[PDB]
């Protein structure tokens, strides 16, 4: 009942190299070699048990923060979110804060959002996709459109007056680059190394101050909503409002979370769609869009593009951006047979589960018409107590980009096969240097 231990070739490496080079092969091999979807690698000195059996996802996603905890594992973010915020806060508090953010990303806010997205998409397309024909890096361009659209939805004109797409991206970048993700397995890393640290603190204070000012200026003004005003309106179980520290942290949580995943989802989708093999699916998308108007609206994209939602999801399915969900085991928990002992990190990998051949036949084929064959096997937005709260919003942007893009352009790869994924980044997407693409304007 203690899960099998993959043997540790070098006391140094643990497994950090092999895993980093091809995670699926590595984990599938671990499964066959060890005869069990549940097994333990020793990454660099800490045991990491992996729930690689999708019939058992609920063992990972359902227990409370008192058993299966995210605080430790997400400490390495304590400087982007800030010391108070999200998972660094006592459990009930964390949950309140997240709720307020989520209260701000539901279908109820999507009222003015589609126009605001669509406008940016056609604006980007009108400065940068000008010609009959042209080459672009699709991952950059999507990435840009995402950050643009998201601001348009979430900040006011006057928030945008001083902090735009550029400024903000510059700012997240000088924050993201503080991050030591390997510090999950050696928390000792958090302490010592401090070079890109003060560069992160000066960004967050810069942002936090722009904010302070905007609020101040926002209060002479009055003498309608957006993401920021929403969060300052929130009230905790007791008295307290949210402190500036906290609001700021949630605005970063949000912009940090959606920044790459949404881009990557859009880009993958478009990539598959433009591939000769996948003509049917692109016929399928093109039928879906036909009787759509030029200005879209809530109905067009929310209720009328199940096929586009299937494509977005199939992309995340094949090539999930967040490859590993993890938690710190506080109390011994059973997972199938096997007890996972306190102290272990426990993990659940969308990448491994999305290639269970029972759950997803022919897993490496991109097929938006497929459905999961084991229920809950798809964990691309996770599940249970920490299921993604931005999913409805992310796919609002992906779908609108799809719709908008495929209305007016075709696309050729400059490559025989769709790009391989690049497992070298925190958040995995197609290989940047394989995403140069040819766009054509229809007629
Ligand atoms: C394609 C877009 C996205 C993908 C593929 C994605 C993937 C995920 C996954 C796998 C989780 C669960 C994490 C865990 O179990 O530890 C998650 C959670 C979360 N996402 Fe996303 N995510 C996406 C978009 C977003 C966006 C745009 C936002 C912007 C708000 C957002 C905010 C959050 C938050 C706050 C959580 C954790 C909330 C909690 O612990 O209750 N997500 N996402
Ligand atoms: O899950 C993330 C944090 N993370 C895990 N690996 C890399 N970043 C990313 N994420 C979740 N949805 C989209 N991106 C997130 C970002 C913010 C947050 F509040 C919680 C949280 F898990």
Numbering used by the authors: 30 to 252, 258 to 477
Sentences from the paper on this structure:
Trypansoma cruzi, the protozoan agent of Chagas Disease, is closely related to two other major global pathogens, Leishmania spp., responsible for leishmaniasis, and Trypansoma brucei, the causative agent of African Sleeping Sickness. Here we report the crystal structures for the CYP51 target in T. cruzi (CYP51Tc) (resolutions 2.35 Å and 2.27 Å) and that of the closely related CYP51 ortholog from Trypanosoma brucei (CYP51Tb) (resolutions 2.7 Å and 2.6 Å), each bound to an anti-fungal triazole drug, either fluconazole or posaconazole. Nevertheless, CYP51Tc and CYP51Tb do share 83% sequence identity, a fact which has been crucial for successfully determining their crystal structures and makes it possible to extrapolate structural features learned from one enzyme toward the other.
As expected, fluconazole is bound in the active site by coordination to the heme iron via the aromatic nitrogen atom of a triazole ring and by multiple van der Waals and aromatic stacking interactions. Although fluconazole occupies the same pocket in both CYP51Tc structures, it adopts two conformations that differ by the 180° flipping of the 2,4-difluorophenyl moiety. Perhaps both ring conformations co-exist in the CYP51Tc-fluconazole complex, possibly correlated with the conformation of the BC-loop which affects H-bonding pattern of Y103. Given that the CYP51Tb active site is virtually identical to that of T. cruzi, the same equilibrium would be expected to occur in T. brucei. However, we could not observe this phenomenon as CYP51Tb-fluconazole complex has been co-crystallized under a single set of conditions with one molecule in the asymmetric unit. The tunnel-forming residues are invariant between CYP51Tc and CYP51Tb with the exception of four conservative substitutions at positions 46, 105, 215 and 359. The residue at position 105 (highlighted cyan in Fig. 7) is known to dominate substrate specificity with respect to the methylation status of the C-4 atom in CYP51 sterol substrates. I105 in T. cruzi allows efficient conversion of C4-dimethylated 24-methylenedihydrolanosterol while the bulkier F105 in T. brucei favors C4-monomethylated norlanosterol. Phenylalanine in CYP51Tb protrudes further into the active site than isoleucine in CYP51Tc, potentially resulting in interference with the 4β-methyl group of the sterol substrate.
